[PDB]
Symmetry: D2
Subunit: 303 residues, 4 copies
């Protein structure tokens, strides 16, 4: 019948001193809880294995590297995959990826989709990196993603995960219609990812009180206009003196929010998902083939 139960595993803060073993325990706990509630897939936050390190300027490269994964899964994260396979619940995990290619230490803000058999189905590397590249004194806390990561090199793919077409986005990506549209054009039925969104923005603080609004607006508009179910898992709460936005959510292809977290701690929410619901949009008001006039969208792709 093409139905399933989707879950979002919101994370509370992760301390700089908090170990990966300790984080995995928290992830295993949420995954198990989701499974008990019938979930077949659970979405975890962006960079969900450590504290959001981009908030600090590093001078020691060994220290910076400590926040990156060189294996996936490694012995420490392995338990999550084993449990996922055991309980038959896939997941989307975000983490910092360090890979050496041709003499270059490549760093990506990454996310992976694992199916209900514990097998990695696909990867995505954050294409829209927000923030800045150089330390900025006027900021109460940094957001050096442009310094610690390079734009993703995998485009915006859509993978078959347990009979569901799933596309991945990572945090800031959710605000760009292009990311949603490319995956929408690739037939995504579910577009999911996580985020680390401070409720304070140094560059434009006059938008602080609109942090939730902008986050939900992006999720709802993206889902609706592409007729795709969506889910966003944030890492929220006061993490290392920086308040992070909560309001993790699951959204229907109509843009209707069907599930929303209300705490700023580890929290699991779930919602029944009918993949055929996407047709109400993609076969009608948003029947791409019947209505789109791409001959007029060229500027969007100009370099």
């Amino acid at each position: 019948t093409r139905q399933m139960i989707l879950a979002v595993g919101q994370q509370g803060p992760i301390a700089r001193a908090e170990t990966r073993e300790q984080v995995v325990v928290r992830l295993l706990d949420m995954l198990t809880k989701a499974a008990s509630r019938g979930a077949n897939f659970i979405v975890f936050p962006e960079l969900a294995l450590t504290t959001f390190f981009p908030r600090w300027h590093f001078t020691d490269e060994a220290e910076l590297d400590s926040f990156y994964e060189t294996e996936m899964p490694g012995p420490v994260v392995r338990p999550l995959f084993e449990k996922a396979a055991e309980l038959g619940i896939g997941f989307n995990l975000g983490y910092a990826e360090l890979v050496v290619e041709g003499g270059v230490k490549r760093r990506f803000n990454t996310s992976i989709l694992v199916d209900k058999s514990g097998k990695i189905v696909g990867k995505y590397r954050k294409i829209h990196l927000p923030g800045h590249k150089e330390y900025e004194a006027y900021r109460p806390f940094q957001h050096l993603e442009k310094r610690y990561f390079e734009p993703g090199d995998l485009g915006f793919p859509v993978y078959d995960v347990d009979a569901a077409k799933m596309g991945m986005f990572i945090a800031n990506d959710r605000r760009w219609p292009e990311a949603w549209r490319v995956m929408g054009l690739r037939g995504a039925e579910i577009i999911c990812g996580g985020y680390n969104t401070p409720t304070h923005n140094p560059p434009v603080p006059q938008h602080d009180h609109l942090t939730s609004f902008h986050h939900l607006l992006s999720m709802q508009a993206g889902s609706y206009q592409n007729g795709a179910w969506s889910a966003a898992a944030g890492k929220a709460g006061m993490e290392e003196n920086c308040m992070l936005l909560g309001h993790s959510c699951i959204v229907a292809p109509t843009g209707e929010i069907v599930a929303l977290t209300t705490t700023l701690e580890d929290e699991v929410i779930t919602a029944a998902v009918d993949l055929d619901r996407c047709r109400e949009l993609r076969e009608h008001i948003f029947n791409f083939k019947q209505h789109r006039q791409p001959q007029h969208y060229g500027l969007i792709a100009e370099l």
Copy 2:
């Protein structure tokens, strides 16, 4: 000058037999009221000179042709232009455009921008035509725009209207991120247009109660993600037995709705507009040149 006062002139229903002279009287009234309240520009609905004729299945070309404009403006509509120049308030007027080229008729769902001097400074032709192509007996009312209009051939231009960079969308266009983005990439500070949106949709009636939601969601998301002020003028009310959506609105570049109509009759709303407000988005979170990666958006422009 970077400050101005924008207005929206929502229309109540226009009867099948209501003359353009009578409609012009209503338009003049709203333009006059808007100017008295400081507005120097007012947005009117899509096809603001006639009843929404695409709701009927025509069998006589002469009857169909009667709903189109062969000149803009003709003697009947000219008074609106004269008053706009007198009071110093430009406008966006929607209408059905009939052009005869070498004995061949061309039909467009059109909108024009007139500056505070009463001069036409730009035209746009609806690119995204909603509805169906053939008569469908089950529908209480049809929506045969695909038959009565050709997709626009002017692309999504942005024009300078009295020191303001303005782009035009027409009804359905507002639901397509591509329309907004093209104009966003062309630097539009204001994106505006009108609409005739029935609160009932025959093919997907399960979205009827979401009519306001989808409309406002599209306007808010479009404004926010392109950092553009926006305005949507609807023709609402029970027109020829078909209930049309109201909730005409003016929206800030943050996506915040600053003005909204509450009736289903002719109604004017105004909002102070600072063209520099756009910078809060376009020079930061949505600084296009700094964050976009167009090399990965190619699929959006593929035919």
Copy 3:
């Protein structure tokens, strides 16, 4: 830890010819589904055993009486109670109650709370009856609740249901702050009920497009201002030619909608409920004892 999983069992239309046995099958199905997802309690709609008969004017008293329950549970509804006890999931059921007292045939729009042991814990009879008392020709469909029911005679009680303080409201009641406040003052941690809300209102059709908005606004404001979790189960869809509002929901004590249905058919939604969350409001911004000045609210209770 004072936690539980609350569910809402939205109903699709119930035909005039649809039997109670057939309705009970649908209710049993949702209750079972909820239980499988970990729900300890499920809220069903107002008058959930029959079609919304108040929409018709009856001349035959025997026919009117056919829609009322004279027993609760009777042999037909008994299965629901048995299953509730089996699976350990309580519920809130709405139905038309007919009881003869002192020679008077009393009719109430009623709802009952049954605990996880299948035992009826408390009853509530609708105090705010909307609509009219006499047949009204100008209406496309009637809403004769004032004719078929008499205002409830049990006040707005709050009962202990499996260690949770629960208050009941029935449809229109949710729009009156007095109903919420009385139960709020009685310590309700969960305020729940169901509804039959046509998306069309004959008296004031200009509010039709606001049906969802007003319903959700009432649920959110009631929850927030009383620091109570809440849930509303509607019977939606096209029932006997009258479209009924969907958007069944579960709301947190902060007023945040945590679960929302998206179809207009039988649909189950669930949300984790922490009764202590009520304290975030009732012990602070809405600490009644510390902030209320009842010496100034007298007019609210004047006859």
Copy 4:
């Protein structure tokens, strides 16, 4: 006359040393701008003449006293009244009222209504005082209103202001359904006031990201359920190192927001107001006399 144009004059921060003369200049500017745009009444913030002093723990009564008004208006504030009479635009002004009775000081958080003739036609004193009573060291800023003000002693009156029945609320009051209902029962057509709402709350910081939501939710629900136009004027921005909420608004009796500010500085918004619109609610769904059952609301007035 049943038509008018209502305005809201939102204030940006008022410094601790900013004089009343300087504040009056800002108020005159907004009143003048509002009138030029057709407004015949403008709502100003709570304590609109000084910085929000309740944020500090005072130890000197003379310093505290300096923030209160001993006369209304005194020579400094009089110019505002004169301009209101000149331009024909009344206003709602909030301020700290200090009264000396038989050698005894009485302190109130007050608001007055002045008609378009510049005459004071009504007064209200804040009944719901938020915050705490004793100094709390952990808080970055205090909120000692319970110490610097006595709960209002005028109840929730409704006054006739230039053919409009208006009621007053002050900040926190807007979150209490009782305040709105009393004025609703007294027939208010417009319920207005101002507010100083920090976007951060020390005791319950987990609701910080919901500050706008709770504010707007309270205004929308209050208007809808009492069928009253409403307006809330906030003093927003970073005032003395404390960020205050913006989103000043004008709301229709349907609960629909018709105007909203987007900056955190002095800002004027206006909306056309039809006093008869109230009837859409008060003569139908919320026809008090026809639907209310006050005999069951007694608990709300119990001391």
